[PDB]
Design a protein around this ligand. Structure first.
Ligand code: CLR
Lengths: 233, 56, 218, 339, 251
C-alpha cells in the first residue's frame, strides 16, 4: 500500500493550490479518507474528511467552506483544493485513510506527506501532560493525555487514538480506540483508563520508540490533538 | 473383486466394535450436570434485562 | 445520536445495499437454462452450436442473455442440488435418437426414467422443457438397418423414420402426470444443421410472456 | 463363495455391536429427566431483521465475538453483517452462485464457502488492501460440498457429496486426511469444542464420529430412516444431535455409542434443514420445512416455542458463543436475529 | 345515498389494507407501484365521498347546516382522475409486457412506473386545480362561463383514457389468442374483459355526468340529482372493485 501525495512547495498569499494524494495498490473506493495537518513545530491538526463513495463531507471548524475536498474513484486520486491561502496555511499536510465497520482500525495507514509554505467552544480538546520526556531505553514509559468530556460512548467504544510520528517520518497507528493495538505494531504497547483519564503504557523501550506521540478524540468533529510528547535519548 | 473392500469393512467393524461403552444414566447425568451448571449463563432460557441485552 | 464511526458504518452498509440491489436487478434478467440428459446424448455438440463440478455456459442471442448449467459432471444424488435449481426458466433435455438399441439396459428407457423423474418433480411444476432429439442421421441409418421394435416391443408401426420418431416423441410427451401446467417443446436436429438456438428462443419467449403476466398481477 | 461368508461375519459383527449397546442400555433419558422441571412457553422476538439478500439463504455462521455473522446465498453473495446495528460489514461476490455452506473462522480472520463447483474457497477478511480476497481455493472433491468448518486458521474439515470428509491444510491446499467410509453423499459436519473429533451425516442414515489427528472412523450411529440433513454437537463434548428428512431429530451420545432422545412431533411431516444448541444446551433449536423453527427442551423433548417468522423454508440456524441470540436464515432471504 | 354508506364500509377496509400490505409488508414491482398509487387514489376519493355523505346525513338528521368547503371537491376530482388513469396505465403496461417481452424483461427502466405515476398524478392534479380555479371551487368566486371548456377537455381526457384502455386490452387479447402456448387463457380473457366492463360501467359514468352530460343535457334539477346519486354510487363501487381486483385476485 502506497499513498504518494503530490504538489506543495511555495505559493503567494491569497493564492490557490490543488493539493493531491494519488492512491496505489489497494481498494481505495471503500475507504473513508481524511486530511490531517501539522505545524512545523506544533502538534497535528485536522483538515477534512470524505467518506468512500462521496456520501458525506465534514470540514474543519477552523476552515469550513473555503477548503474543498474531492475524490476520484476511477483514477484513485484524492484532491484537496484550497482557496485564498492565509498566513495559517503554512503546514505539513498528510493523507490519511481509515475504514469504518465493526472491528475496523480507523486511521491506520498514512501518506508520505507534503509541505506547502505561504507568506471552538463545544470542541473536545486534548491536553497532554508534557512536551518532552527524558527516559533511558529498557524501562517502562507512561504517556498521559487529557480529555474535556468523557470518551466512552454507550455502545462501549472509546474513541481515543495513539499515533507516533518518528522524527523525519510519517505517522503510523499504535493503539486505535484506546485499548486496541494496530497490526504491524509489536505487543509491548498497551493503554487503559476510564473516561477522560487515559495513559499510554509503553513497556521495554528500544531505539525506534523515539518520536512524538499523539492523542485524538473521535466522538464528533473536529479531530483535535494534543501537543505531543517528544521522546529522545 | 470386492474381497479387499469388504474385508476392509469387516476389519473396520471389528476395530469399531471393541471399545468401551459407559452406562446411560452416567451420560445423561453428565447432561444434567452441564445444563444445571450453565443455566444462569444461558441468555436464552432466562430473559436478560434490556439494559444488558445488546439487542434492544 | 450515534458516533461518526457508526455513522460511517451506516453509510458503508448503505453503499453495500446499493451494490447488492444493482447486482440482483442485473441478475434477474439473464435466462437460466438447466441442461439435463444422459452423457452420450450429444450435449457437447449443442454446447458448440449454442455458443470439475458444475459447468456453466454463457451465450447471448437477440438481446437476451442466457445461462446454461450443464450439471452432468455432478455424479451424485440428484435430489439435493435439484431442489437448488428451482426458479430456472426452461430445461433442455437431450435425447439421442440413435441409442434405442445401443447398450449401456437400453438408453431410451433410462432417458424416460430421467424425463419422468424431472417432469413429476415437485420443484419443476411450472417449468417449460425444451426437449431436443439428437443425432437424427444416425437414427436414419439405424432405422434403415434395424427396426425399433427391439427397443419398443409393444410398437407396431410403419418402421420408417417419421412414424417411429413421432412414436418415441409421443412416448416422451406422455410421461407427464399433469399436462396443463408444464408445456413441453420438442425439436429434431442433427450436428450439421445450423439454426437450433431459435427453437430455444421461442420456448423461452413464451415462458417470458407467462412470467411477464405474473409480474403484472395477471 | 468367500465374499458371502465374509459379509455374514460382517452381519454377526453388527449383531455384537447391537447387543453390546443394548446390553449397556438401561434407562431412556426421559425416564430420569422427569424430575427436572420444564422451561415452558418462552418467547423469542425478532430483535433484528437483516435484509439485503435476494435469492435463497443456504447457510450462516456466527462469530466468536458473538456480534458478527456471515451468510451465503444463491445469488452469489457472501455477506458479513454486524448483527447489532444491522450493518453490512462486507459483501463478497462468489465465483459460484451455487453455494450450500459457509463458515466463519474462530479467530475471525477468515470465511469459507463451498458448493456445486466442488471447491471450498477460503476468503481473507482482514486484508491490508481492504477488500476480501480468495486466499486458498481448495479443489479436491468430486462431488458437491455440503459443509466446510474451520478448526484453526490453517485446518478446515470439509463434508462433501462424494462420501468423503476431508481435513485440509490451507497453506499447501492439499488434503492431509481423507475420511472415507460413508455410503452416500455426506451432508453435514460439527466440530468438538476441543477440536479433536467431529461428526458427519449422510444419505445412508448413518452418523459417524471421526478423529481429526489420526484419521479413522471412531464410532458410527445408525438411528435415522432417511437422509440426515444437518448435525450439531453438544457443548459438553460428550453428545451430539442430528436432523433428517423424516421430520425427526435424534440426540446421540459419543461415550455411550447409542441413541438418547427422539425429537419428533406428529404435526411435522417435513424434514429438518438445520440444528443448533443453546449455551447451556437446554434448548435444541431445529429449522424445518414448514417454514418455521421449533425450539426443543433438549432434555425433555417438549415443543417449548416456535420461531415463526419466515415466508419460506428455514435453511440455517445458529446460536452465539455467549448464547445471546439466535440467527435464522431462510429461503425468503431474510436473516432474523432472535433473542 | 343510503347505500353508499355501506359500500364505503367495504371500500375503506380494502384500499388502506392494500396500503398496509404493499408499503410495509411486501416487495414492490413496477405493477405494485401502480396498485399502491391506485389504492391511494381510491382511498382519498372514498374518504371525501364518505365525508360528503356524512355532512348530507348530518343535514338530514341533526340539521346543523354546516357546508363542506369547496376546496374538497377539487382534490376529490384529482383522486378520481388519478385512479382512472392508473387503470389505463395498468392495462397499457400489461399490453406492453405481452407485446414486447424482451423489452419488458431486459431493457425496461427501473423507475418508469414511479415516473409515469407521478406524471399522471401531476396531470390529474393540474386538470383538477384548473377546474377549481375556473369553476367556483378555488379562488373563491369562479365564473361559470369558461368552466365548460375545462370540463370538456377533462371529458375528452376520460374518453381518451377509455380509448387507450380498450385499444390496449384489444391488442393484448388478440396478441394472446393469436399465439399462446402455456397461458391460462380463460381467467386471462375474463379478467381483461372484466376490467374493461368495470371501467365502462363504474368509473366512467360519474365523470361523464359531472363534466359532459350536466352541461350538454340541459334538463335542469330534477334529473340532475337523480342521475347524480346513482353515478356517484357506481364510482364508489368501482373503487371497491379496484381493491378487490387489482391485488387480491393476483395475490
Ligand atoms: C404530483 C404530486 C404534486 C401529487 C402527489 C400526490 C401524493 C398524495 C401521492 C399519492 C400516491 C403517491 C405515490 C405512491 C408511490 C410511489 C412510489 C415511490 O417509489 C415513488 C413515489 C410514489 C410515485 C408516490 C408519489 C406521490 C403520490 C402520487
Amino acid at each position: 500500500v502506497q499513498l504518494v501525495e503530490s504538489g506543495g512547495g511555495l505559493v503567494q498569499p491569497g493564492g490557490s493550490r490543488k493539493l493531491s494524494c494519488s492512491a496505489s495498490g489497494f481498494a481505495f473506493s471503500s475507504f473513508g479518507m481524511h486530511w490531517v495537518r501539522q505545524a512545523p513545530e506544533k502538534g497535528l491538526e485536522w483538515v477534512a474528511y470524505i467518506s468512500s463513495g462521496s456520501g458525506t463531507i465534514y470540514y474543519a471548524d477552523t476552515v469550513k467552506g473555503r477548503f474543498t475536498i474531492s475524490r476520484d474513484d476511477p483514477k484513485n486520486t484524492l484532491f484537496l483544493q484550497m482557496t485564498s491561502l492565509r498566513s495559517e496555511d503554512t503546514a505539513m499536510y498528510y493523507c490519511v485513510r481509515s475504514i469504518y465497520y465493526y472491528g475496523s482500525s480507523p486511521f491506520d495507514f498514512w501518506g508520505q506527506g507534503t509541505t506547502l509554505t505561504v507568506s471552538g467552544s463545544a470542541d473536545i480538546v486534548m491536553t497532554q501532560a508534557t512536551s518532552s520526556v527524558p527516559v533511558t531505553p529498557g524501562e517502562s514509559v507512561s504517556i498521559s493525555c487529557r480529555s474535556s468530556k468523557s470518551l466512552l460512548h454507550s455502545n462501549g467504544n472509546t474513541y481515543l487514538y495513539w499515533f507516533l510520528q518518528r522524527p523525519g517520518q510519517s505517522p503510523q497507528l499504535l493503539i486505535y480506540r484506546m485499548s486496541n493495538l494496530a497490526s504491524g505494531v509489536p505487543d509491548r504497547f498497551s493503554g487503559s483508563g476510564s473516561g477522560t483519564a487515559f495513559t499510554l503504557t509503553i513497556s521495554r523501550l528500544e531505539a525506534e520508540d523515539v518520536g512524538v506521540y499523539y492523542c485524538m478524540q473521535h466522538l464528533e468533529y473536529p479531530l483535535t490533538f494534543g501537543a505531543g510528547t517528544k521522546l529522545e535519548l | 473383486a470386492s474381497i479387499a473392500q469388504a474385508r476392509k469393512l469387516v476389519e473396520q467393524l471389528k476395530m469399531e466394535a471393541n471399545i468401551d461403552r459407559i452406562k446411560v444414566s452416567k451420560a445423561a447425568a453428565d447432561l444434567m450436570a452441564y445444563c444445571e451448571a450453565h443455566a444462569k449463563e444461558d441468555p436464552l432460557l432466562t430473559p436478560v434485562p434490556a439494559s444488558e441485552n445488546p439487542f434492544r | 445520536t450515534l458516533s461518526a464511526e457508526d455513522k460511517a458504518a451506516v453509510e458503508r452498509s448503505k453503499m453495500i445495499d446499493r451494490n447488492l440491489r444493482e447486482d440482483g436487478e442485473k441478475a434477474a434478467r439473464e435466462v437460466k437454462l438447466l441442461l439435463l440428459g444422459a452423457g452420450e446424448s450429444g450435449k457437447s455438440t449443442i454446447v458448440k452450436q449454442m455458443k470439475t463440478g458444475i459447468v456453466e455456459t454463457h451465450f447471448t442471442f437477440k438481446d437476451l442473455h442466457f445461462k446454461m448449467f450443464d450439471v452432468g459432471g455432478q455424479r451424485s444424488e440428484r435430489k439435493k442440488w435439484i431442489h437448488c435449481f428451482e426458479g430456472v426458466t426452461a430445461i433442455i433435455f437431450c435425447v439421442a435418437l440413435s441409442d434405442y438399441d445401443l447398450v449401456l439396459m437400453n438408453r431410451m428407457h433410462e432417458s424416460m426414467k430421467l424425463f419422468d423423474s424431472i417432469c413429476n418433480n415437485k420443484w419443476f411444476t411450472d417449468t417449460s422443457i425444451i426437449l431436443f432429439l439428437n443425432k437424427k442421421d444416425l437414427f436414419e441409418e439405424k432405422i434403415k438397418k434395424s427396426p425399433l421394435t427391439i427397443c419398443y416391443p409393444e410398437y407396431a408401426g410403419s418402421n420408417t423414420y417419421e412414424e417411429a420418431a413421432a412414436y418415441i416423441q409421443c412416448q416422451f410427451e406422455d410421461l407427464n402426470k399433469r399436462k396443463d401446467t408444464k408445456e413441453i417443446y420438442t425439436h429434431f436436429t442433427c450436428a450439421t444443421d445450423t439454426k437450433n438456438v431459435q427453437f430455444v428462443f421461442d420456448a423461452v419467449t413464451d415462458v417470458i410472456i407467462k412470467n411477464n403476466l405474473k409480474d403484472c398481477g395477471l | 463363495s468367500e465374499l458371502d461368508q465374509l459379509r455374514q461375519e460382517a452381519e454377526q459383527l453388527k449383531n455384537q455391536i447391537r447387543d453390546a449397546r443394548k446390553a449397556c442400555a438401561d434407562a431412556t433419558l426421559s425416564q430420569i429427566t422427569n424430575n427436572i422441571d420444564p422451561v415452558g412457553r418462552i418467547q423469542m422476538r425478532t430483535r433484528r431483521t437483516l435484509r439485503g439478500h435476494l435469492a435463497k439463504i443456504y447457510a450462516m455462521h456466527w462469530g466468536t465475538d458473538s456480534r458478527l455473522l456471515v451468510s451465503a446465498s444463491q445469488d452469489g453473495k457472501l455477506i458479513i453483517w454486524d448483527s447489532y446495528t444491522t450493518n453490512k460489514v462486507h459483501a463478497i461476490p462468489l465465483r459460484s452462485s451455487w453455494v450450500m455452506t459457509c463458515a466463519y473462522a474462530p479467530s475471525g480472520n477468515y470465511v469459507a464457502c463451498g458448493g456445486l463447483d466442488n471447491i471450498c474457497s477460503i476468503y481473507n477478511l482482514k486484508t491490508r488492501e481492504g477488500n476480501v480476497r480468495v486466499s486458498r481455493e481448495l479443489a479436491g472433491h468430486t462431488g458437491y460440498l455440503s459443509c466446510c468448518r474451520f478448526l484453526d486458521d490453517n485446518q478446515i474439515v470439509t463434508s462433501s457429496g462424494d462420501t468423503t470428509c476431508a481435513l485440509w491444510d490451507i497453506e499447501t491446499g492439499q488434503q492431509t486426511t481423507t475420511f472415507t467410509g460413508h455410503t452416500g453423499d455426506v451432508m453435514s459436519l460439527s466440530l468438538a469444542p476441543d477440536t479433536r473429533l467431529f461428526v458427519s451425516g449422510a444419505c445412508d442414515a448413518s452418523a459417524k464420529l471421526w478423529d481429526v489427528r489420526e484419521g479413522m472412523c471412531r464410532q458410527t450411529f445408525t438411528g435415522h430412516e432417511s437422509d440426515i440433513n444437518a448435525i450439531c454437537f453438544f457443548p459438553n463434548g460428550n453428545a451430539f444431535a442430528t436432523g433428517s428428512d423424516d421430520a425427526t431429530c435424534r440426540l446421540f451420545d459419543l461415550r455411550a455409542d447409542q441413541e438418547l432422545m427422539t425429537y419428533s412431533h406428529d404435526n411435522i411431516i417435513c424434514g429438518i434443514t438445520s440444528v443448533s444448541f443453546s449455551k447451556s444446551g437446554r434448548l435444541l433449536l431445529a429449522g424445518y420445512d414448514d417454514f418455521n423453527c421449533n425450539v426443543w427442551d433438549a432434555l425433555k423433548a417438549d415443543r417449548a416455542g416456535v420461531l415463526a417468522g419466515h415466508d419460506n423454508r428455514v435453511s440455517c440456524l445458529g446460536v452465539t458463543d455467549d448464547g445471546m441470540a439466535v440467527a435464522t436464515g431462510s429461503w425468503d432471504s431474510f436473516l432474523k436475529i432472535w433473542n | 345515498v343510503f347505500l353508499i354508506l355501506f359500500i364505503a364500509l367495504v371500500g375503506l377496509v380494502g384500499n388502506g389494507f392494500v396500503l398496509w400490505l404493499l408499503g410495509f409488508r411486501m416487495r414492490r414491482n413496477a405493477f405494485s407501484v401502480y396498485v399502491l398509487s391506485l389504492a391511494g387514489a381510491d382511498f382519498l376519493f372514498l374518504c371525501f365521498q364518505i365525508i360528503n355523505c356524512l355532512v348530507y346525513l348530518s343535514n338530514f338528521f341533526c340539521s346543523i347546516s354546516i357546508n363542506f368547503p369547496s376546496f374538497f371537491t377539487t382534490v376529490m376530482t384529482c383522486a378520481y382522475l388519478a385512479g382512472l388513469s392508473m387503470l389505463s396505465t395498468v392495462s397499457t403496461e400489461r399490453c406492453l409486457s405481452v407485446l414486447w417481452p424482451i423489452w419488458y424483461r431486459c431493457r425496461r427502466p427501473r423507475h418508469l412506473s414511479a415516473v409515469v405515476c407521478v406524471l399522471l398524478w401531476a396531470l390529474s392534479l393540474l386538470l383538477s386545480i384548473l377546474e377549481g380555479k375556473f369553476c367556483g371551487f378555488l379562488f373563491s368566486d369562479g365564473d361559470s362561463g369558461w368552466c365548460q371548456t375545462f370540463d370538456f377537455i377533462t371529458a375528452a381526457w376520460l374518453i381518451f383514457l377509455f380509448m387507450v384502455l380498450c385499444g390496449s386490452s384489444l391488442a393484448l387479447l388478440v396478441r394472446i389468442l393469436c399465439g399462446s402456448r402455456g397461458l391460462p387463457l380463460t381467467r386471462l380473457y375474463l379478467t381483461i374483459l372484466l376490467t374493461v366492463l368495470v371501467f365502462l360501467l363504474c368509473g366512467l359514468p360519474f365523470g361523464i355526468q359531472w363534466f359532459l352530460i350536466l352541461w350538454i343535457w340541459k334538463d335542469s334539477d330534477v334529473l340532475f340529482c337523480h342521475i347524480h346519486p346513482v353515478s356517484v354510487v357506481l364510482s364508489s363501487l368501482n373503487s371497491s372493485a379496484n381493491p378487490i381486483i387489482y391485488f387480491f385476485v393476483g395475490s
